[PDB]
Design a protein around this ligand. Structure first.
Ligand code: ZN
Lengths: 90, 227, 42, 293, 179, 55, 35, 76, 147, 97, 206
RNA sequence: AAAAUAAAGUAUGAAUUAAUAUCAAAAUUUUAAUAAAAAUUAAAAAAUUA
RNA sequence: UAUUUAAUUUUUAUAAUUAAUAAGAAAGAAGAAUAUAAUUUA
């Protein structure tokens, strides 16, 4: 029993409890009749130049639960012929 | 080595199990005497990894005897300790097995083990014996009385007859135990075993003979009762 | 030391030494203008 | 080299920004920092900028320039126009693999004379058996794929229960694949082999002859979408009959497997055109083969 | 023997206990009250000291060393904890894994990167280990009564943690002494 | 052996799964419908019935 | 590794796919292009 | 205590008896061969306590027998 | 080159009995099949008997596998297959003159009458082909794409 | 042709017709033992039926085939019968010229 | 159009009826249950053995959203039968694993069955039909009480065979992957929190 | 490195050895000479085999 | 033999939120053994 793993042993379920307490927010924003997916503002400055003068880019992705909910519910459309009937070059 | 006698003994699945012996020579010798003996009397009670091996070999002898060929015979004759048994094989088994192709021998794992060592005992028979000429109505559930006596026969089957040339051989080999020097061999064997000592071997003064004339004259009596 | 889901972006995880293994802090160590320095005037 | 170009967070601000830097008032984006409504909270020696000629002009140039030469700046459009969700982001998205069987070994020739040694894998039935997201956390999503339709009494009773709950036909085997939320396919989906492209690379995880092994680079050679085979230019050390977990090798040394140069995957999964029926289709015309190596 | 050779283990599926939910002769939940300790602008090791005092049960007059009776301290805003002067950079945290390559020397700053709260756990562990070492239960059981949250948001509103009014009497900044 | 072992050393072996398995274990069995003897499934009697129908 | 996915094997089911047939098939495609 | 004797475990799942279900026994028999001796239709891996039949277990391509209640003498 | 003595089947007829009982009954089967399709005698040629397999595991869809009564397109929502109908097959060939349409017509006719014959088990060739001479099963093969 | 399970497919006839010219010298009268899956036992039982010839095996009534493979017991007989049925005619054609 | 093969007959009882395949067969072969709650409850009581319990549960947890309130009520009532207010809620234990020093206990397929049912209820009454719990208090109290009967917030006593040696199977993970399956399952989480937030309107306006 | 032989096993049953507590794992410094001695920090589960 | 490592505790439907550099009814053959999960078989 080292220090770190006892720490995580105790605190992992507390992290879970805390993010659960974060979750119940949307629940009280649900029961009240409102239904909304809390929105993340789009970050316009992801393109940069560092001190050595070269291009650095920040990859920022935003998952949409309303898209996902439909993606687990129903099939994709039919696979285009441009894909499988021609190979992928190396 | 795909040829249906000559054997390969490994532990890999292509090969039939190598039962413990001294040298692959010794192994082959053992195999030969198990086959010989199983051809002679149809069942063989056999311990260990030998039993599956013995079944497969048996199936091979029957397959050969089915081939019914001169090279086949002579190949079987290389393999057996007994020449006469080759003849008994090629005479019997083709009528016997004409209607089946595969698995001619039946292996049965027995619920008793050698007390000598934990090894398990198997009962290996040739399959259907009702087409067999000389083994026809026999019952191996229990042994016969004196081991040189012709084996038991099922009650419904009593009056069966057997190939003359086989019972000739059998009686010849039997008649050396009704002799006196065998009785001497018996007593002296008790003495020998006692010296090496194996426990529960009676003193040679207590050993009274396997064969007497009274027991004989009743044995022959019920033997012609079965005929 | 990469386990779990690993995104196809060639190296994101490289500079913190190749692992995804903590990531749940909202708080980090900051020079001026880095994160929790949000609230101090400069 | 194997490191990206380092950038510290203290350095990202108005003067280091590649495109114009934008300040966020939360209803509106402006190029001026937000002037606090309570004026008495202004700091000494701080300018509040309502207008700035220098920064506003440069911006003005930039925009009009973007509109009048859309052909030169079509890359700049990435700044202003982000890709929506789904739609296979090249950098973001990860799909699930499928569960194979090492069937036999083979030998093939390419265009020139060369002796290839191929191992053939078989994907008898691949369905999506389960969806699992762990406590709703991000990037924790798994799609569990099953293989080999199997008689009712095969498994210990507790596995059969699992398949009964799911609704899927009972499988001999399952494997999970971590994926991104866009790569989900509804539980019970039949997966084909053309889910893999014949020219790609594939990560393979199987049992060695005796722990688990992973081959991360291996390219795909040839594909039978009738007999649902797949071929690899490799000799595995594995038993015939061994189940093998297939995946896409997501990157090779700074290079994504999936891009416009190389090509694009059938993204959530391959789906077959309804008109085709494999029952009318022979073995040979069912072949898909790679370009020359 | 009295204590068993077959033990609860970290690898063993049964798992390690949580002493909060545990019921044992020397553990008492009856007389406990909850505290709310704001570490905003307070020195790390001093916060850890006071917290350890409440956690342990040393602040009650009926404190008996065998008996473990704590009070629950909710330590809030660890992120704002102050470490005087150069110390954030210059104060090392060491540990030794049993293997070749058995030295880890790590700046406070780095532990803070990984978790801010693991720092508070560190100095807590120290302040408790000061008096309780020689037995495991007395080292581990108290620590679970510290609830560390690196900002103002915590689940425990239902306990109504009483603000813990504490002003460190100590004038000088903390100092690092490790032999 | 560098040292004499105490009673606990000696007892530690019996916690093991190996020791339990080898020595103290109960066999499953039923009554042979033919022999009325106790029997483990998979082993049989040298008898004409047991060899044909192995019960 | 003792897990289920790795231990269990599909050998028993091989009769569902005609290995011999497909090998001969690609031997036909071997002589068709002249290798 | 009541005597320590185990109740009948013959009809529960056993891993070593489970091996013999799909094993090929043609050589173990002579007069009396049955289609698959050890395999009980509908029941998991041979065991009678673990019966699955006439529940919803979805098996598109394999056969399934219907349910008749087992007797008392076939379990214990 | 043209394709040689391969013959497209009409029906394939199954039996629950093994191959050894059916050889005796092969001569009477042709007589019945002839008035099943109501053609004259000698019109139908039965291919070689095929015993299928004794499946412990039962791999489905295999060239040798015991055919089952249930079928997917027949019962869509059944969660399983009805047990094994046929352990042994024999093919039905007509005259070679018939083109691909006629053979399939005589096929659908046979299934047509045979189904009702199996349901009649709830004088005419159908139940003679079912009751005293066992055939429990019939199918129309898939045209091979292999040409 | 050889290891084929169950039915004999037409793609498989193709294999045979292809391997017909792999062997240059063959007459429709060729001895049985050149056939796919013709064993010693299979040949022997064919011979006591007075059949030495690929023509003679392509002349079989198929109810000879079955009882040859069931009451008699040559396995894979239908494979050699079918192989013959296939091959017999191209042999006559390569026989004329 | 027409059969590709004959169909051998059955009488009324031995048919496979009671289920239906998903709308699109050639793509998704998932099987949905059409069975009425009446006969699932029936199967649950009348065939008491484990596997039919599991099957009943697995069916009525597929079908939750499609049933009305009182249907749900007789379901929960039927299901809650084998639970003591005194006893450990969800524990069904089969094998003792003596492998390591101290005995380890494995539950049987009933446990993931009941949990799967609770989670199905969570998706139904919180996510896609949030109104339904507010509408009828009857089924609110029903769900709450069945939820208290099995004790969902101490999963640790599902894995405990003796109250003297309480198992941490639900609360403990290691990074080497002990208890990966039995690790933290949000179980009653969304359900309980949500149906708290139904009572959590303290505002004087409403 | 292929080939032959020998290792779970039933039964029999010795010999070297033995100050010890249910044991003594990892590191750092010191102490009159390895220091399994001290002190500090620490983190060693059981069984079986090599 | 003590320690120390490496392996194992005999199918775990599934593996990685952290440490360091993971475990469902049981033992004969794992094979009814001559590589088919029965090659038809009395
Ligand atoms: Zn018996």
């Amino acid at each position: 029993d080292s220090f770190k793993e006892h720490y995580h042993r105790v605190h992992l379920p507390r992290r879970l409890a805390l993010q659960r307490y974060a979750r119940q927010q949307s629940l009280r924003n649900a029961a009240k009749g409102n239904v909304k997916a809390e929105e993340v503002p789009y970050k316009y400055n992801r393109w940069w130049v560092n001190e050595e003068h070269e291009f650095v880019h920040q990859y920022a992705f935003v998952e949409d639960p309303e898209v996902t909910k439909a993606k687990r519910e129903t099939l994709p459309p039919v696979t285009r012929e441009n894909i499988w009937k021609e190979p992928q070059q190396t | 080595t795909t040829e249906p006698l000559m054997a390969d003994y490994g532990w890999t699945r292509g090969k039939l199990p190598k039962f413990r012996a001294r040298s692959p020579f010794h192994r082959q010798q053992i195999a030969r005497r198990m086959v010989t003996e199983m051809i002679r009397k149809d069942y063989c009670i056999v311990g260990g990894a030998r039993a599956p091996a013995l079944r497969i070999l048996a199936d091979h002898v029957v397959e050969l005897a089915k081939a019914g060929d001169t090279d086949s015979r002579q190949q079987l004759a290389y393999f057996l300790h007994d020449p006469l048994m080759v003849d008994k094989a090629f005479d019997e088994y083709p009528r016997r097995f004409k209607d089946m192709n595969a698995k001619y021998a039946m292996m049965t794992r027995l619920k008793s083990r050698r007390r000598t060592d934990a090894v398990a005992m198997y009962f290996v028979e040739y399959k259907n014996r009702d087409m067999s000429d000389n083994h026809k109505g026999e019952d191996y559930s229990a042994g016969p009385e004196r081991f040189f006596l012709p084996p038991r026969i099922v009650e419904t089957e009593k009056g069966i007859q057997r190939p003359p040339h086989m019972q000739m051989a059998f009686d010849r080999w039997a008649s050396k135990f009704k002799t006196e020097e065998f009785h001497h061999w018996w007593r002296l064997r008790h003495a020998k075993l006692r010296y090496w000592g194996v426990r529960n071997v009676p003193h040679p003064s207590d050993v009274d003979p396997l064969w007497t004339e009274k027991e004989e004259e009743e044995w022959h009596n019920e033997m012609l009762a079965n005929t | 030391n990469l386990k779990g889901l690993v995104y196809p972006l060639p190296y994101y995880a490289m500079w913190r030494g190749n692992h995804n293994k903590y990531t749940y802090n909202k708080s980090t160590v900051c020079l001026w203008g880095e994160g929790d320095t949000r609230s101090m005037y400069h | 080299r194997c490191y990206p170009s380092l950038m510290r967070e203290k350095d990202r601000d108005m003067y280091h920004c590649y495109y114009p830097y934008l300040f966020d008032h939360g209803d509106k984006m402006s190029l001026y920092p937000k002037i606090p409504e309570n004026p008495r909270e202004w700091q000494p020696e701080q300018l509040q900028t309502t207008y700035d000629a220098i920064r506003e002009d440069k911006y003005d140039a930039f925009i009009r320039l973007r509109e009048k030469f859309p052909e030169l700046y079509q890359d700049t459009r990435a700044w202003d126009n982000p890709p929506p969700f789904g739609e296979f982001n090249m950098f973001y998205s990860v799909r699930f693999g499928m569960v194979g069987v090492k069937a036999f070994t083979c030998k093939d020739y390419d265009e020139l004379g060369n002796q290839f040694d191929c191992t053939a894998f078989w994907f008898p039935d691949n369905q999506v058996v389960k969806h699992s997201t762990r406590n709703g956390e991000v990037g924790t999503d798994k799609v569990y794929v099953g293989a080999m339709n199997v008689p009712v009494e095969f498994h210990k009773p507790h596995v059969a229960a699992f398949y009964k709950a799911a609704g899927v036909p009972v499988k001999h085997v399952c494997a999970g694949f971590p994926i991104t939320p866009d790569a989900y396919a509804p539980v019970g989906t039949k997966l084909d082999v053309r889910h893999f492209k014949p020219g790609q690379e594939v990560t393979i995880t199987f049992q060695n002859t005796a722990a688990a092994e992973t081959y991360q680079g291996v390219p795909v050679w040839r594909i039978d979408y009738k007999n649902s085979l797949i071929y690899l230019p490799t000799l595995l050390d594995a038993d015939v009959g061994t189940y093998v977990r297939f995946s896409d090798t997501i990157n090779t040394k700074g290079l994504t497997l999936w891009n416009e140069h190389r090509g694009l995957p059938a993204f959530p999964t391959f789906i077959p055109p309804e008109d085709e029926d494999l029952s009318k289709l022979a073995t040979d015309e069912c072949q898909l083969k790679s370009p020359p190596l | 023997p009295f204590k068993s050779v077959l033990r609860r283990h970290k690898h063993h599926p049964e798992g390690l206990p949580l002493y909060n939910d545990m019921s044992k002769q020397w553990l008492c939940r009856e007389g406990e009250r909850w505290w709310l300790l704001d570490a905003r602008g307070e020195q790390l090791p001093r916060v850890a000291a006071v917290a350890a005092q409440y956690i342990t049960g040393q602040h009650r007059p009926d404190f008996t060393p065998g008996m473990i009776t704590g009070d629950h301290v909710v330590i809030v805003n660890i992120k704002d904890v102050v470490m005087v002067g150069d110390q954030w950079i210059r104060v090392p945290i060491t540990w030794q894994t049993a293997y070749p390559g058995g030295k880890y020397r790590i700046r406070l700053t780095d532990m803070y990167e990984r978790d801010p709260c693991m720092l508070m756990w560190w100095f807590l562990k120290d302040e408790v280990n000061r008096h309780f070492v020689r037995k495991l239960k007395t080292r581990i059981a108290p620590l679970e009564k510290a609830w560390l949250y690196e900002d103002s948001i915590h689940p425990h509103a239902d306990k109504n943690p009483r603000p813990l009014c504490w002003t460190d009497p100590e004038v000088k900044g903390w100092k690092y002494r490790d032999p | 052996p560098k040292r004499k072992k105490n009673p606990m050393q000696l007892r530690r072996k019996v916690y093991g799964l190996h020791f339990k398995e080898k020595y103290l274990k109960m066999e499953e069995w039923y009554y042979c419908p033919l022999c009325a003897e106790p029997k483990k499934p998979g082993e049989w009697c040298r008898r004409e019935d047991c060899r044909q129908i192995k019960p | 590794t003792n897990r289920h996915f790795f231990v269990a094997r599909a050998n028993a089911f091989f009769s569902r796919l005609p290995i011999a047939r497909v090998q001969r098939s690609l031997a036909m495609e071997a002589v068709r292009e002249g290798r | 205590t009541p005597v320590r004797d185990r109740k009948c475990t013959l009809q529960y799942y056993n891993p070593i008896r489970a091996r013999f279900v799909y094993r090929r026994d043609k050589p173990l028999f002579d007069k009396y061969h049955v289609t698959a001796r050890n395999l009980a239709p509908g029941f998991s891996r041979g065991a009678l306590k673990h019966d699955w039949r006439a529940l919803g277990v979805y098996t598109p391509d394999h056969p399934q027998v219907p349910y008749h209640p087992l007797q008392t003498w076939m379990l214990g | 080159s043209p394709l040689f003595g391969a013959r497209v089947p009409c029906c394939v007829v199954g039996t629950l009995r093994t191959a050894k009982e059916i050889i005796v009954l092969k001569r009477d089967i042709q007589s019945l099949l002839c008035e099943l399709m109501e053609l004259p005698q000698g019109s139908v040629t039965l291919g070689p008997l095929q015993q299928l397999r004794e499946m412990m595991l039962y791999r489905h869809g295999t060239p040798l596998s015991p055919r089952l009564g249930d079928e997917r397109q027949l019962n869509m929502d059944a969660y399983a297959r009805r047990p094994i109908a046929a352990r042994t097959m024999m093919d039905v060939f007509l005259a070679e003159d018939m083109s691909l349409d006629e053979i399939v017509n005589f096929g659908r006719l046979s299934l047509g009458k045979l189904q009702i014959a199996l349901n009649n088990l709830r004088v005419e060739p159908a139940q003679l082909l079912v009751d005293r001479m066992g055939i429990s099963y019939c199918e129309i093969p898939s045209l091979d794409e292999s040409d | 042709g050889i290891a084929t399970g169950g039915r004999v497919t037409n793609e498989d006839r193709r294999w045979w017709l292809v391997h017909l010219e792999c062997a240059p010298d063959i007459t429709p009268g060729t001895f049985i033992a050149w056939l796919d899956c013709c064993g010693t036992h299979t040949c022997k039982k064919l011979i006591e039926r007075n059949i030495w010839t690929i023509e003679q095996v392509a002349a079989l009534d198929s109810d000879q085939v079955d009882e040859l493979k069931y009451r008699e017991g040559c396995l894979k007989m239908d494979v050699v019968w079918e192989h013959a049925r296939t091959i017999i005619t191209p042999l006559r054609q390569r026989e004329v010229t | 159009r027409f059969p590709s093969q004959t169909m051998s007959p059955c009488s009324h009882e031995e048919e496979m009826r009671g289920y239906v395949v998903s709308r699109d067969y050639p793509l998704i072969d998932r099987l949905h249950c059409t069975r009425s709650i009446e006969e699932l409850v029936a199967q649950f009581e009348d065939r008491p053995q484990i596997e039919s319990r599991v099957a009943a549960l697995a069916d009525m947890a597929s079908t939750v959203s499609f049933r009305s309130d009182e249907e749900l009520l007789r379901m929960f009532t039927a299901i809650s039968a084998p639970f003591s207010v005194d006893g450990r809620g969800l524990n069904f234990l089969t094998v003792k694993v003596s492998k390591f020093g101290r005995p380890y206990y494995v539950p049987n397929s009933l446990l993931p069955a009941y949990v799967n049912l609770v989670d199905a209820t969570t998706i139904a009454l919180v996510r896609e039909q949030p109104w339904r719990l507010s509408a009828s208090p009857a089924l609110f109290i029903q769900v709450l009480q069945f939820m208290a009967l099995i004790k969902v917030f101490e999963p640790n006593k599902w894995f405990t065979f003796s109250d003297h040696a309480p198992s941490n199977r639900a609360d403990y993970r290691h990074a080497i992957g002990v208890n990966h399956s039995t690790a933290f399952w949000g179980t009653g989480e969304e359900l309980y929190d949500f149906m708290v937030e139904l009572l959590r309107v303290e505002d004087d306006g409403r």
